[PDB]
């Protein structure tokens, strides 16, 4: 079968160089050419470029015209993705798909579209350092009931969280992650349980950070 | 040339010097790809010795063309509710075209005996014609896009042919070789001959090869026949005894 | 160059209906550039019409295409839970492009949400600013307007919004909003209010809470 | 950028003899130790041949290019660099064009937009061209490079294929036998009829060194060449320059005993030719049916038979 695998996630700063791998197997290399598109988060797709392997001839879009280079080493049979002066506007998730559009050796179009694609490559944008998580219950109030956990400056995105280590995962809400203007994230997490379950049953919120290396987890009681 | 049939059903496949049977094991030097747009009723014309308005104003093949055609119908692909215009036949020129010859005469042409001054008049049609193919036409007008194999096969390093693998060399015995798609019999053994770099194979003054160059290594080998004879029975009559003897 | 406009913006069906979607291109593009993407949540776009009539390998006979000339549809003759995903047409008949997406959701029954507020935390006070939470739970479907108010009037611009994807066995959407201010404004009022209105409530619901 | 000189001696070229030149392998089988019999484009023996001297001395017509060209260079000190091919040799049409500045050999094969008199001139003024379209073909490789230099070249293109033989030897072209190994083949498919000669001027106003070109033309005949040992050409017979040329190629040898040989058979051609038809009689009544004085109505369109006659 025809596989892709492709690079890690990176939070460099912004104005620097992006380097992207893309490895393939299981099909002929020089026979097919490389495209290189993005997904914005919240946006629809946006195609890049495109290279293809038997004699390096390339084709960039305008926009990134003056930003992209494509190469290709038949060696390993990976192809490298360089892109300089990164902007703020580059977080979103990259595809490295398999040509069948324009060919590669006569350069000209042919009958197909993208037909295979990577894993995604995570390019995250934002000028600020790695921070611990901070952790804050939300109680239900005096008068089914409901509480949560709010959790506020983790840095970066990756961060799991956890109810009782997964006991009572049928009722844990995880609404999507929202960015300030001071660049830190925000997330929560909503637990609703009887009424007759808040003075007697036990709830602990648990918030993993791996880049810091945090397992931080707090009781969260009514008040 | 094992995956071929993975297309629309062909109408037109015809192979001329090679059978197409799964005899993807020959090596050529080069193979020359000749991919147009006709229409049905002129498929016919694309053959050695055949005579037409496409044969002889827009492609002739020679008379011993070793290769092949595909024509296959593209109605779907190229067919127009308005009428596609952009493909184009000459019907009119002076003499006809010799083989493998591309013609894109623009000028006028000289029906009669005036000048046509460079513009449409009297005695001066254009050239160039349309097809003008719609899905609503016949089966003979509907557009077909043929391709046609050109193979060469010259005393050339041949670097064109089918996945077949190579094993060792052995020499002073006789086996079976298959030198690049020459096959034989025989011992072959290191060669003294002093061949220069432009040459392949040697021949002797029995017109026949009894030299070649390894595809692999520039050695050359000199081919001979494995061992041979005549055998002679003698006899006393089969009245006096059973015993004979045996020369070679 | 060319632009390709997909409809409708959302499609909301069911698991057993027929899905058709529209493409169209501001130029002529041949049949043959055209190319029709599902991509689902999590995982990677793949490929499964080109040339907007034939059928990629490994795809459902269910899915089919068509079209000319200026206008492209892409028809599901039956839906399935699986098949709810973002729907992209593309043409590299000039340059290449892509489009915006189209979205395909589930079409259930009206519902109702139980919007409850959460004032900030203790802890919060003494680290200089606090933040209230405005919660929606299940309701259906998706548009409810939501507003913050300090005991007289309307406020916007400081407040967060994170809306959720389709449930996995309701299909209904949970909604948040976040509030934070420093804590010198924070004691400068007592009373504040989240005003929820939606198309299965036949009234907007206000909920206020004071200090305590 | 074009360089403007005429400077030009305007005198006719010489003509002289290419007695056993142009003599190259026709193919890359090896043999050896045999007389072979091969028809082929080869140039003539004795043949005529056109001498240019450059030397002030600055002639560099363009020449037609048939079905083959022989070129010979007597030179010292690399005044001939390249060469250019083509029909029209603008952008309407197709052009090669090779250079050899003595640092690598580039065969250039695109559409071109040449002055009218490209040539070059430490190596600092290239004024050949002006343009550059699309380009079908490029290539680069190893330089090929009293009088000691001399240069045999031959250029032949057939079926779409551009092949070149050369050979390189030290020193009116010299009697002797030289055979011509291939050097360079390619797959262009260029219309090629006429065709010019490259020079490199020393500048000091310029004055170039004295060389020598000859150009001869190829033609289709038999030819009978003869190996020794070694598989090198050392020998050959022209079957159609003499009567007893066509004799030692009958007889397949070099020697030929006293007697009498039948050697061939002698036929005259025709001249003209001449067509005879019975004439043009009792034509089909087609001026009845058109000018007809009064025409029936479409409803009632009269059909008339029209046979045994001449359909005019
Ligand atoms: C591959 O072929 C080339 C052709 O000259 C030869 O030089 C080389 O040794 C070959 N490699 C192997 C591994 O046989
Ligand atoms: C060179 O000679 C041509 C010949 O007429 C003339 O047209 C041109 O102006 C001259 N100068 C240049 C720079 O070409
Ligand atoms: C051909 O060569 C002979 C002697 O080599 C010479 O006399 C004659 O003039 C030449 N032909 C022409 C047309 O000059
Ligand atoms: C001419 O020679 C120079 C080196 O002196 C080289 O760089 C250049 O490519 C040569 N040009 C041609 C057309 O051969
Ligand atoms: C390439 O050829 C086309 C016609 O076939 C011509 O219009 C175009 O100008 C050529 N390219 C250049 C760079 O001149
Ligand atoms: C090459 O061009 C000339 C220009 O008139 C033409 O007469 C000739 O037929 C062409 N050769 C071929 C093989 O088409
Ligand atoms: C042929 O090659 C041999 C190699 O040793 C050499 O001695 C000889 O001079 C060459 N020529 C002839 C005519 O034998």
């Known amino acids: 079968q025809v596989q892709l695998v492709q690079s890690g996630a990176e939070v460099k700063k912004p104005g620097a160089s992006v380097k992207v791998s893309c490895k393939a197997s299981?099909?002929?290399?020089?026979?097919?050419?490389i495209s290189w598109v993005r997904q914005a988060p919240g946006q629809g797709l946006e195609w890049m470029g495109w290279?293809?392997?038997?004699?390096?001839?390339?084709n960039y879009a305008q926009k990134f015209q003056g930003r992209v280079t494509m190469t290709t080493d038949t060696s390993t049979t990976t192809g490298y993705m360089e892109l300089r002066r990164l902007r703020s506007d580059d977080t979103a998730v990259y595809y490295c798909?398999?040509?069948?559009?324009?060919?590669?050796?006569?350069?000209?179009?042919?009958?197909?579209?993208?037909?295979?694609w990577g894993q995604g490559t995570l390019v995250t944008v934002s000028s600020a350092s790695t921070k611990g998580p901070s952790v804050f219950p939300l109680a239900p109030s005096s008068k089914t009931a409901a509480l949560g956990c709010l959790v506020k400056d983790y840095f970066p995105e990756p961060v799991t969280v956890s109810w009782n280590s997964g006991a009572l995962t049928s009722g844990v809400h995880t609404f999507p992650a929202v960015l300030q203007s001071s660049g830190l994230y925000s997330l929560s997490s909503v637990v609703t349980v009887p009424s007759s379950s808040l003075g007697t049953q036990t709830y602990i919120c648990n918030v993993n950070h791996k880049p810091s290396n945090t397992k931080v987890d707090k009781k969260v009681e009514p008040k | 040339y094992s995956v071929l049939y993975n297309l629309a059903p062909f109408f037109t496949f015809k192979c001329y010097g090679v059978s197409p049977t799964k005899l993807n094991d020959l090596c050529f030097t080069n193979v020359y790809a000749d991919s147009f747009v006709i229409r049905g009723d002129e498929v016919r014309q694309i053959a050695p010795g055949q005579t037409g308005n496409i044969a002889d104003y827009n492609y002739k093949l020679p008379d011993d063309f070793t290769g092949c055609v595909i024509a296959w119908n593209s109605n779907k692909l190229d067919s127009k509710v308005s009428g596609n215009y952009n493909y184009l036949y000459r019907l009119f020129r002076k003499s006809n075209l010799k083989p493998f010859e591309r013609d894109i005469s623009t000028e006028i042409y000289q029906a009669g005996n005036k000048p046509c001054n460079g513009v449409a008049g009297f005695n001066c049609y254009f050239p160039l014609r349309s097809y003008s193919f719609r899905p609503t036409y016949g089966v003979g007008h509907q557009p077909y896009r043929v391709v046609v194999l050109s193979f060469e096969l010259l005393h050339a390093p041949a670097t064109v042919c089918g996945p077949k693998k190579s094993t060792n060399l052995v020499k002073n015995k006789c086996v079976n070789f298959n030198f690049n798609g020459l096959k034989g019999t025989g011992v072959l053994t290191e060669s003294n001959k002093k061949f220069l770099p432009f040459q392949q194979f040697g021949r002797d003054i029995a017109d026949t090869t009894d030299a070649v160059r390894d595809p692999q290594t520039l050695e050359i080998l000199d081919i001979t026949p494995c061992s041979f004879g005549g055998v002679s029975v003698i006899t006393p009559g089969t009245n006096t005894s059973n015993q004979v003897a045996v020369l070679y | 160059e060319i632009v390709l406009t997909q409809s409708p913006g959302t499609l909301s069906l069911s698991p057993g209906e027929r899905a058709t979607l529209s493409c169209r291109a501001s130029?002529?593009?041949?049949?043959?550039?055209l190319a029709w993407y599902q991509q689902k949540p999590g995982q990677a776009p793949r490929l499964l019409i080109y040339?907007?009539?034939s059928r990629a390998t490994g795809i459902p006979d269910r899915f089919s295409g068509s079209g000319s000339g200026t206008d492209f549809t892409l028809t599901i003759s039956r839906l399935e839970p699986e098949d709810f995903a973002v729907y992209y047409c593309?043409?590299?008949?000039?340059?290449?492009?892509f489009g915006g997406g189209t979205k395909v959701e589930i079409k259930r029954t009206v519902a109702a949400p139980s919007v409850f507020i959460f004032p900030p935390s203790d802890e919060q006070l003494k680290s200089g600013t606090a933040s209230v939470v405005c919660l929606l739970n299940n309701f259906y479907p998706r548009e409810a307007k939501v507003q913050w108010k300090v005991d007289n009037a309307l406020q916007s611009g400081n407040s967060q919004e994170s809306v959720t994807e389709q449930d996995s066995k309701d299909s209904t959407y949970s909604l948040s909003s976040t509030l934070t201010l420093s804590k010198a404004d924070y004691e400068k009022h007592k009373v504040y209010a989240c005003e929820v209105t939606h198309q299965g409530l036949s009234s907007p619901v206000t909920k206020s809470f004071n200090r305590g | 950028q074009c360089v403007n000189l005429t400077t030009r001696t305007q005198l006719p070229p010489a003509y002289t003899n290419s007695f056993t030149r142009g003599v190259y392998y026709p193919d890359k089988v090896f043999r050896s130790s045999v007389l072979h019999s091969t028809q082929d484009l080869f140039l003539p023996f004795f043949s005529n041949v056109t001498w240019f001297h450059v030397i002030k001395r600055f002639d560099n017509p363009v020449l037609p290019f048939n079905d083959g060209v022989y070129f010979a260079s007597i030179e010292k000190s690399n005044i001939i660099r390249g060469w250019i091919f083509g029909t029209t040799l603008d952008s309407k049409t197709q052009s090669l064009l090779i250079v050899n500045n003595a640092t690598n050999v580039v065969i250039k094969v695109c559409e071109f937009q040449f002055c009218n008199d490209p040539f070059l001139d430490m190596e600092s003024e290239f004024r050949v061209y002006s343009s550059a379209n699309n380009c079908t073909f490029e290539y680069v490789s190893q330089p090929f490079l009293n009088f000691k230099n001399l240069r045999e070249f031959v250029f032949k293109n057939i079926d779409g294929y551009f092949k070149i033989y050369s050979k390189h030897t030290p020193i009116d072209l010299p009697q002797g036998f030289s055979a011509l190994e291939p050097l360079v083949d390619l797959p262009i498919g260029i219309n090629i009829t006429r065709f010019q000669t490259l020079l490199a001027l020393h500048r000091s106003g310029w004055t170039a060194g004295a060389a020598a070109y000859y150009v001869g033309y190829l033609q289709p005949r038999t030819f009978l060449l003869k190996y020794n040992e070694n598989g090198t050409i050392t020998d050959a017979v022209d079957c159609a320059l003499d009567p007893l040329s066509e004799t030692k190629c009958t007889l397949k040898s070099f020697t030929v005993e006293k007697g009498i040989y039948q050697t061939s058979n002698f036929r005259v051609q025709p001249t003209e030719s001449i067509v005879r038809f019975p004439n043009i009689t009792n034509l089909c009544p087609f001026d009845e049916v058109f000018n007809a004085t009064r025409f029936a109505s479409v409803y009632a369109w009269n059909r008339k038979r029209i046979s045994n006659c001449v359909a005019d």
């Open positions: 798909a398999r040509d069948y559009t324009r060919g590669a050796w006569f350069g000209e179009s042919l009958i197909g579209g993208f037909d295979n």
């Open positions: 299981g099909y002929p290399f020089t026979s097919y050419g």
């Open positions: 290279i293809s392997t038997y004699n390096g001839n390339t």
């Open positions: 130029q002529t593009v041949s049949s043959t550039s």
């Open positions: 040339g907007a009539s």
């Open positions: 593309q043409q590299h008949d000039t340059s290449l492009t």
